[PDB]
From Swiss-Prot:
Similarity annotation: Belongs to the transient receptor (TC 1.A.4) family. LTrpC subfamily. TRPM8 sub-subfamily.
Cysteine disulfide links: none
Gene knockout outcome: Trpm8-deficient mice have severe behavioral deficits in response to cold stimuli.
Name of this protein: Transient receptor potential cation channel subfamily M member 8
UniProt source species: Mus musculus (Mouse)
Gene: Trpm8
Portion of the parent chain present: 103 to 153 of 1104
Job description of the protein: Non-selective ion channel permeable to monovalent and divalent cations, including Na(+), K(+), and Ca(2+), with higher permeability for Ca(2+). Activated by multiple factors, such as temperature, voltage, pressure, and changes in osmolality. Activated by cool temperatures (<23-28 degrees Celsius) and by chemical ligands evoking a sensation of coolness, such as menthol and icilin, therefore plays a central role in the detection of environmental cold temperatures.
SUBUNIT field: Homotetramer. Interacts (via N-terminus and C-terminus domains) with TCAF1; the interaction stimulates TRPM8 channel activity. Interacts (via N-terminus and C-terminus domains) with TCAF2; the interaction inhibits TRPM8 channel activity.
UniProt subcellular location: Cell membrane; Membrane raft
Domain of life: Eukaryota
Notes concerning its domains: Cooling agents bind within a pocket formed entirely by the S1-S4 helices that opens to the cytoplasm.
Annotated tissue distribution: Expressed in dorsal root and trigeminal ganglia. Specifically expressed in a subset of pain- and temperature-sensing neurons. Not expressed in heavily myelinated neurons. Not expressed in neurons expressing TRPA1 or TRPV1.
Modification note: N-glycosylation is not essential for but facilitates cell surface expression, multimerization, association with lipid rafts and ion channel activity.
């Protein structure tokens, strides 16, 4: 758990279902979305 300061980070297992992650990130945290944009890059150092 815990905040990050120099945001909110979380270590979580891969085998969890996405519905309780959505319930975490929308109920305990900020609101819903009209849109969701994804970007793929990160193999480029």
């Amino acid at each position: 758990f815990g905040d990050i300061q120099f945001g909110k980070y979380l270590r979580l297992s891969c085998d969890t279902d996405s519905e309780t992650l959505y319930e975490l990130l929308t109920q305990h945290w900020h609101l819903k979305t009209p849109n969701l944009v994804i970007s793929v890059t990160g193999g480029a150092k």
